Amino acid sequence: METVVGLTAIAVALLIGLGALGTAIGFGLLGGKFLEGAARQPEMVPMLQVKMFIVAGLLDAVTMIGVGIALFFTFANPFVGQI
Template sequence: MELGVLAGGIMIGLAALAAGIGNGLLFSRYLEGITRQPEAQSKLFSQAMITLGLVEALPIISIAFGILVLFGIVPPK
């Protein structure tokens, strides 16, 4: 049980960290892009938001995994 709590915590924490780095990179590139080409803002906005959805998929799925491990449904090997 203790290992499960540790594994779940690490899983959720690392996924949040990775998503944070991903979002930071995405929006830095987006801002860079609209600074260079302000006329492409609307096109870049929808692209950036779709990518944001993909980046945020990782912590969401990882939270599902983490909760299952945390509460002992999936035992850590």
């Protein structure tokens, strides 16, 4: 049984870690274009900020499916029942 419990801790770390890595690089790309666009014309900032949050919902979609499943593997455990 210790293999199933130990490999669940790694699965949780890979599932949260690969989401922490992708969201930080993915928003640093988008964020830089938002600051650049703000510098080109500060009159369009309120509109551009709303457009940035509209893309933020597509960018952080699947990374939260892994943070939810990882927090569901630390407290609950669907693999222990399967023996």
